[PDB]
Enzyme design. Structure first.
Site, PDB file in Angstrom:
ATOM      1  N   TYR A 193      39.161 -29.047  77.997  1.00  0.00           N
ATOM      2  CA  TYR A 193      40.410 -28.835  78.724  1.00  0.00           C
ATOM      3  C   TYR A 193      41.308 -30.064  78.735  1.00  0.00           C
ATOM      4  CZ  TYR A 193      43.270 -27.623  82.925  1.00  0.00           C
ATOM      5  OH  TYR A 193      44.237 -27.396  83.874  1.00  0.00           O
TER       6      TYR A 193
ATOM      7  N   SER B 263      36.060 -40.066  87.728  1.00  0.00           N
ATOM      8  CA  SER B 263      36.258 -39.074  88.767  1.00  0.00           C
ATOM      9  C   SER B 263      36.467 -39.790  90.085  1.00  0.00           C
ATOM     10  CB  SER B 263      35.029 -38.175  88.916  1.00  0.00           C
ATOM     11  OG  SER B 263      35.130 -37.361  90.088  1.00  0.00           O
ATOM     12  N   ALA B 264      37.451 -39.330  90.876  1.00  0.00           N
ATOM     13  CA  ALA B 264      37.664 -39.902  92.201  1.00  0.00           C
ATOM     14  C   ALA B 264      36.573 -39.485  93.180  1.00  0.00           C
ATOM     15  CB  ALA B 264      39.095 -39.585  92.667  1.00  0.00           C
TER      16      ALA B 264
ATOM     17  N   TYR C   4      26.483 -35.432  89.595  1.00  0.00           N
ATOM     18  CA  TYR C   4      27.648 -35.640  88.737  1.00  0.00           C
ATOM     19  C   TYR C   4      28.393 -36.897  89.164  1.00  0.00           C
ATOM     20  CZ  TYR C   4      32.401 -35.405  87.008  1.00  0.00           C
ATOM     21  OH  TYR C   4      33.623 -35.706  86.452  1.00  0.00           O
TER      22      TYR C   4
ATOM     23  N   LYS D 194      29.065 -40.568  87.160  1.00  0.00           N
ATOM     24  CA  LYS D 194      30.361 -41.158  86.856  1.00  0.00           C
ATOM     25  C   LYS D 194      30.425 -42.591  87.412  1.00  0.00           C
ATOM     26  CE  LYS D 194      33.077 -39.087  84.979  1.00  0.00           C
ATOM     27  NZ  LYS D 194      33.350 -38.638  83.587  1.00  0.00           N
TER      28      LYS D 194
ATOM     29  N   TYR E 231      40.428 -39.477  89.141  1.00  0.00           N
ATOM     30  CA  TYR E 231      41.301 -38.387  89.565  1.00  0.00           C
ATOM     31  C   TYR E 231      40.398 -37.263  90.046  1.00  0.00           C
ATOM     32  CZ  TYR E 231      40.008 -36.919  84.938  1.00  0.00           C
ATOM     33  OH  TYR E 231      39.233 -36.549  83.858  1.00  0.00           O
ATOM     34  N   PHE E 232      41.047 -36.282  90.674  1.00  0.00           N
ATOM     35  CA  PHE E 232      40.376 -35.125  91.251  1.00  0.00           C
ATOM     36  C   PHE E 232      40.518 -33.904  90.353  1.00  0.00           C
ATOM     37  CE2 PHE E 232      40.461 -37.751  95.233  1.00  0.00           C
ATOM     38  CZ  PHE E 232      39.113 -37.687  95.521  1.00  0.00           C
TER      39      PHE E 232
ATOM     40  N   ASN F  19      34.944 -26.482  89.606  1.00  0.00           N
ATOM     41  CA  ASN F  19      34.959 -27.510  90.615  1.00  0.00           C
ATOM     42  C   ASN F  19      36.046 -27.319  91.690  1.00  0.00           C
ATOM     43  OD1 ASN F  19      32.875 -28.972  89.429  1.00  0.00           O
ATOM     44  ND2 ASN F  19      34.361 -30.088  88.081  1.00  0.00           N
ATOM     45  N   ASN F  20      36.969 -26.403  91.455  1.00  0.00           N
ATOM     46  CA  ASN F  20      38.066 -26.214  92.403  1.00  0.00           C
ATOM     47  C   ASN F  20      38.406 -24.739  92.408  1.00  0.00           C
ATOM     48  OD1 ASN F  20      40.881 -25.712  90.969  1.00  0.00           O
ATOM     49  ND2 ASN F  20      39.758 -27.097  89.622  1.00  0.00           N
TER      50      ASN F  20
ATOM     51  N   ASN G 157      37.369 -16.416  98.664  1.00  0.00           N
ATOM     52  CA  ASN G 157      36.693 -16.889  99.871  1.00  0.00           C
ATOM     53  C   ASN G 157      37.227 -18.277 100.188  1.00  0.00           C
ATOM     54  OD1 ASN G 157      35.307 -14.533 100.253  1.00  0.00           O
ATOM     55  ND2 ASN G 157      33.285 -15.381  99.809  1.00  0.00           N
TER      56      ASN G 157
ATOM     57  N   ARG H 166      42.865 -30.736  99.323  1.00  0.00           N
ATOM     58  CA  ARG H 166      42.288 -31.324  98.118  1.00  0.00           C
ATOM     59  C   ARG H 166      43.408 -31.764  97.196  1.00  0.00           C
ATOM     60  NH1 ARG H 166      38.755 -31.089 101.278  1.00  0.00           N
ATOM     61  NH2 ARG H 166      36.505 -30.546 100.945  1.00  0.00           N
TER      62      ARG H 166
HETATM   63  N1  NAD Z   1      37.512 -30.994  85.227  1.00  0.00           N
HETATM   64  C1  NAD Z   1      37.345 -31.807  86.251  1.00  0.00           C
HETATM   65  O1  NAD Z   1      37.274 -31.363  87.421  1.00  0.00           O
HETATM   66  C2  NAD Z   1      37.217 -33.276  86.050  1.00  0.00           C
HETATM   67  C3  NAD Z   1      37.506 -34.136  87.126  1.00  0.00           C
HETATM   68  C4  NAD Z   1      37.379 -35.501  86.960  1.00  0.00           C
HETATM   69  C5  NAD Z   1      36.906 -36.013  85.762  1.00  0.00           C
HETATM   70  N2  NAD Z   1      36.605 -35.152  84.721  1.00  0.00           N
HETATM   71  C6  NAD Z   1      36.060 -35.722  83.488  1.00  0.00           C
HETATM   72  O2  NAD Z   1      36.803 -35.262  82.397  1.00  0.00           O
HETATM   73  C7  NAD Z   1      35.993 -35.106  81.231  1.00  0.00           C
HETATM   74  C8  NAD Z   1      36.486 -33.786  80.589  1.00  0.00           C
HETATM   75  O3  NAD Z   1      36.561 -32.832  81.635  1.00  0.00           O
HETATM   76  P1  NAD Z   1      37.121 -31.449  81.150  1.00  0.00           P
HETATM   77  O4  NAD Z   1      37.626 -30.774  82.425  1.00  0.00           O
HETATM   78  O5  NAD Z   1      38.161 -31.378  80.097  1.00  0.00           O
HETATM   79  O6  NAD Z   1      35.829 -30.614  80.763  1.00  0.00           O
HETATM   80  P2  NAD Z   1      35.463 -29.831  79.421  1.00  0.00           P
HETATM   81  O7  NAD Z   1      34.046 -29.346  79.607  1.00  0.00           O
HETATM   82  O8  NAD Z   1      36.510 -28.855  79.105  1.00  0.00           O
HETATM   83  O9  NAD Z   1      35.545 -30.947  78.301  1.00  0.00           O
HETATM   84  C9  NAD Z   1      34.410 -31.786  77.961  1.00  0.00           C
HETATM   85  C10 NAD Z   1      34.115 -31.566  76.492  1.00  0.00           C
HETATM   86  O10 NAD Z   1      32.981 -32.373  76.160  1.00  0.00           O
HETATM   87  C11 NAD Z   1      32.179 -31.632  75.245  1.00  0.00           C
HETATM   88  N3  NAD Z   1      30.841 -32.156  75.303  1.00  0.00           N
HETATM   89  C12 NAD Z   1      29.931 -32.022  76.322  1.00  0.00           C
HETATM   90  N4  NAD Z   1      28.791 -32.609  76.065  1.00  0.00           N
HETATM   91  C13 NAD Z   1      28.979 -33.184  74.806  1.00  0.00           C
HETATM   92  C14 NAD Z   1      28.123 -33.914  73.966  1.00  0.00           C
HETATM   93  N5  NAD Z   1      26.862 -34.232  74.298  1.00  0.00           N
HETATM   94  N6  NAD Z   1      28.595 -34.344  72.783  1.00  0.00           N
HETATM   95  C15 NAD Z   1      29.836 -33.986  72.427  1.00  0.00           C
HETATM   96  N7  NAD Z   1      30.728 -33.280  73.132  1.00  0.00           N
HETATM   97  C16 NAD Z   1      30.226 -32.906  74.331  1.00  0.00           C
HETATM   98  C17 NAD Z   1      32.360 -30.199  75.678  1.00  0.00           C
HETATM   99  O11 NAD Z   1      31.964 -29.257  74.679  1.00  0.00           O
HETATM  100  C18 NAD Z   1      33.810 -30.122  76.104  1.00  0.00           C
HETATM  101  O12 NAD Z   1      34.665 -29.636  75.071  1.00  0.00           O
HETATM  102  C19 NAD Z   1      34.565 -35.473  81.668  1.00  0.00           C
HETATM  103  O13 NAD Z   1      34.281 -36.853  81.449  1.00  0.00           O
HETATM  104  C20 NAD Z   1      34.633 -35.273  83.198  1.00  0.00           C
HETATM  105  O14 NAD Z   1      33.650 -35.977  83.912  1.00  0.00           O
HETATM  106  C21 NAD Z   1      36.781 -33.799  84.853  1.00  0.00           C
HETATM  107  O1  LIG Z   2      36.057 -17.493  96.331  1.00  0.00           O
HETATM  108  C1  LIG Z   2      35.127 -17.996  95.660  1.00  0.00           C
HETATM  109  C2  LIG Z   2      35.225 -19.366  95.001  1.00  0.00           C
HETATM  110  C3  LIG Z   2      36.566 -19.980  95.151  1.00  0.00           C
HETATM  111  N1  LIG Z   2      36.797 -20.365  96.550  1.00  0.00           N
HETATM  112  C4  LIG Z   2      36.959 -21.628  96.947  1.00  0.00           C
HETATM  113  O2  LIG Z   2      36.753 -22.624  96.209  1.00  0.00           O
HETATM  114  N2  LIG Z   2      37.407 -21.768  98.233  1.00  0.00           N
HETATM  115  C5  LIG Z   2      37.514 -22.963  98.902  1.00  0.00           C
HETATM  116  C6  LIG Z   2      37.401 -24.273  98.444  1.00  0.00           C
HETATM  117  C7  LIG Z   2      37.557 -25.047  99.523  1.00  0.00           C
HETATM  118  C8  LIG Z   2      37.530 -26.513  99.771  1.00  0.00           C
HETATM  119  C9  LIG Z   2      36.339 -26.896 100.686  1.00  0.00           C
HETATM  120  C10 LIG Z   2      37.327 -27.170 101.815  1.00  0.00           C
HETATM  121  C11 LIG Z   2      38.481 -27.121 100.818  1.00  0.00           C
HETATM  122  O3  LIG Z   2      37.780 -24.246 100.610  1.00  0.00           O
HETATM  123  N3  LIG Z   2      37.722 -22.893 100.189  1.00  0.00           N
HETATM  124  N4  LIG Z   2      33.929 -17.383  95.457  1.00  0.00           N
HETATM  125  C12 LIG Z   2      33.492 -16.115  95.882  1.00  0.00           C
HETATM  126  C13 LIG Z   2      34.349 -15.164  96.433  1.00  0.00           C
HETATM  127  C14 LIG Z   2      33.838 -13.941  96.783  1.00  0.00           C
HETATM  128  N5  LIG Z   2      32.541 -13.610  96.638  1.00  0.00           N
HETATM  129  C15 LIG Z   2      31.736 -14.544  96.109  1.00  0.00           C
HETATM  130  C16 LIG Z   2      32.151 -15.783  95.703  1.00  0.00           C
END
Ligand code: NAD
Ligand code: A1IU5
Ligand code: NAD
Ligand code: A1IU5
Lengths: 344, 343
Positions: free
Chosen positions: B11, B130-131, B155, B159, B183-184, B204-205, B222, B237
């Site tokens: 992503y 990651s924050a 996780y 980090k 970042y978050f 994660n969100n 939910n 968040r």
């Molecule tokens: N998405 C979030 O919430 C978030 C938040 C903070 C930091 N990050 C950091 O960002 C990075 C990317 O996150 P993202 O959201 O794009 O996730 P993502 O899963 O989409 O991207 C990670 C990529 O790494 C690849 N990958 C995983 N293991 C691998 C391996 N062993 N060798 C090669 N490739 C591998 C996956 O196939 C994937 O395409 C990570 O370091 C993560 O910790 C993500």
């Molecule tokens: O809705 C869901 C998942 C998405 N919901 C989500 O992340 N909500 C949140 C997140 C937060 C943060 C903690 C305080 C702020 O607060 N609320 N799952 C589900 C629904 C129905 N049936 C089964 C599973």
């Protein structure tokens, strides 16, 4: 399953632990890559050749690196391990500051790979030889197991903390694991035979091997890093544990695994710290030699005093250190004098 | 010289590859497809689309960062200036269940990358952190002086441990330059609608779960608690548009050329959003009602967590432009054009 794997078993603490394992009726298999152990005239490391003579028992040994996945996989297929005692690692603090990636690779990647293979083979019983430097700078003394961990001041200490945290999370995720993390400070002394001991390659890093080499005539004079600390005599107070007591504590930990204990953490130590001058005095007493020293600047980051509380181990492991300061020094001196150049 | 992007099919990585090309760099991506979609040819679909969006080529090698031999050959085959490191496992809830997988991929993968970088003289790194390394907030907004290491899941610990290893490498070798970006929650999508976040196993969100709602693939969101110490009682968040996030990685890459040593920056908008604010923004963007049900809190969740991005403005010259409404509009466009993602 009925063998005990001892990684890094040719080294200082490992060789003493292999001896205690044999005396206690276990069947060890030792692996070591000779990074910090001397070769004997045969297959065994010299330390373990001598352990076989001291105990009358054979040591099964493979030369291998725990970073080599294929070797580790083959090892666990060949032997049926019931538990692992993990000493293989890098442990020189000053080297760790200069070469962090080597410390993270051997200590972290090595341990992760060991855990992964143990899991794959259903060997979920570990004694991890940790370090009380994971407590960081003391917030109270003596340090007990409730004291915070983390905030380590060098890559070695950080690596040990990171490994502890990984093992703790593994055990939280899988309640069938049993793991004992043993935290301690400075192993000192030697088996009472004088036949094995710590054999530093090059100029020793640590106080006691340096002092012993001053006593034997191998080194000029000790550097004392600071004499203006908030301690009784102004020199730093540290925690020294006889290596034989330490080795016995690893066997007690191995027994604790059989209780299906989950993740347990124990300090090992005598409970009393000694200053640099107290150690020097006790080594002059044991050796009969003058041990000259000069006081130089404090090292950045060194604290006045650090020592551990071993009360929990004395209860739950049935373990007490029996050997005090004079024995540590007498036993170090005997090894030094019987083996002026060490193993080689 | 080229820029290696590990995990570049995913992503944030795919958006960053696009921004590298827009900024005049030459990207080489590695990915093992653990969490990315294969295209009908040799490229991940995300990167095939990036080529169409930019008019430029992306070089790509399918490989695992855990494979030392593959990495050694990669650094001999290409001449890199710098590395942007995204490859890793990142689902917080998964990490609790499978901690050893997280430690192995994230720690061993990163250590092997750093060692091979060193072995080939590539000493310029952007680490996507990651924050969550700040742990539960002790003050808000979180700035770079806030304590780190109080992490609540494997996780976040992984980090933080990586950050510490990089800090120690930079202490040992002053010629390294490394920017750690904290970042978050990334959300939104490239404004073309052609790339975005594929459907995730363990988000994660709440925003996709929500995006599965507005389209009609879930009944109701939910909401975990409405009794928090927040304006509206629901949790607050921190959400950053993935395009702003990607651009912050380019700003970090440029900062390396200043011979900056080790630097740490938060990225974010500077304002947190509650659950109800996210729902309302998504209703506005999508034109659909988004039902919800308030349920009990999850143990351990805090009322509010969001980052202060001021230092990045001062030292990276970077700010986030895109607010919550644009995050929702861009997510909705991706969802409408690609209802099941690339598949
Ligand atoms: N998405 C979030 O919430 C978030 C938040 C903070 C930091 N990050 C950091 O960002 C990075 C990317 O996150 P993202 O959201 O794009 O996730 P993502 O899963 O989409 O991207 C990670 C990529 O790494 C690849 N990958 C995983 N293991 C691998 C391996 N062993 N060798 C090669 N490739 C591998 C996956 O196939 C994937 O395409 C990570 O370091 C993560 O910790 C993500
Ligand atoms: O809705 C869901 C998942 C998405 N919901 C989500 O992340 N909500 C949140 C997140 C937060 C943060 C903690 C305080 C702020 O607060 N609320 N799952 C589900 C629904 C129905 N049936 C089964 C599973
Ligand atoms: N000596 C101390 O002050 C001290 C204090 C606390 C904890 N520890 C821990 O005790 C352990 C042993 O310490 P020690 O004092 O006996 O040191 P040591 O160096 O004498 O023993 C370690 C052994 O591991 C071997 N080894 C190293 N890397 C290996 C690898 N990749 N594969 C296989 N074998 C490898 C070495 O060759 C050596 O024989 C380490 O885990 C260390 O962190 C030591
Ligand atoms: O002496 C040496 C090494 C051994 N010296 C040692 O461990 N001393 C110490 C240890 C401590 C602790 C910190 C406060 C308590 O305080 N002093 N090396 C050397 C000697 C002469 N020339 C070159 C090198």
């Amino acid at each position: 399953a009925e063998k005990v794997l001892v990684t890094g078993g040719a080294g200082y603490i490992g060789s003493h632990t292999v001896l205690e394992l044999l005396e206690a009726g276990y069947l060890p298999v030792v692996i070591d890559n000779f990074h910090n152990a001397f070769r004997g005239g045969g297959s065994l490391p010299e330390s373990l050749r001598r352990v076989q003579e001291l105990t009358g028992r054979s040591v099964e040994f493979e030369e291998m690196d725990i970073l080599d996945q294929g070797a580790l996989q083959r090892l666990f297929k060949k032997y049926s391990f019931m538990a692992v005692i993990h000493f293989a690692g890098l442990k020189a603090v000053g080297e760790s500051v200069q070469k962090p990636l080597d410390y993270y690779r051997v200590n972290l990647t090595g341990t992760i790979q060991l855990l992964e293979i143990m899991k794959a083979h259903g060997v979920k019983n570990l004694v991890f030889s940790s370090s009380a430097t994971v407590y960081g700078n003391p917030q109270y003394l003596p340090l007990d197991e409730a004291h915070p961990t983390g905030g380590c001041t060098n890559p070695y200490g950080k690596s040990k903390f990171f490994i502890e945290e990984m093992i703790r999370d593994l055990c939280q995720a899988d309640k069938t694991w049993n793991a004992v993390l043993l935290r301690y400070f400075n192993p000192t002394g030697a088996h009472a035979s004088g036949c094995i001991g710590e054999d530093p390659q090059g100029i020793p890093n640590n106080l006691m091997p340096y002092v012993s080499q001053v006593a034997i005539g191998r080194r000029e004079a000790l550097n004392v890093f600071g004499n203006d600390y908030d301690t009784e005599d102004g020199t730093g107070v540290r925690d020294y544990i006889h290596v034989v007591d330490l080795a016995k504590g690893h066997i007690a930990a191995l027994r604790k695994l059989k209780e299906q204990c989950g993740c347990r953490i124990y300090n090992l130590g005598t409970g009393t710290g000694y200053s640099v001058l107290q150690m020097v005095q006790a080594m002059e007493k044991a050796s009969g030699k003058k041990i000259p020293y000069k006081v130089v600047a404090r090292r950045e980051g060194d604290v006045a005093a650090c020592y551990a509380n071993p009360s929990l181990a004395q209860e739950e492991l049935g373990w007490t250190a029996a050997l005090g300061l004079d024995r540590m020094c007498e036993d170090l001196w005997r090894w030094q004098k019987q083996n002026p150049s060490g193993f080689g």
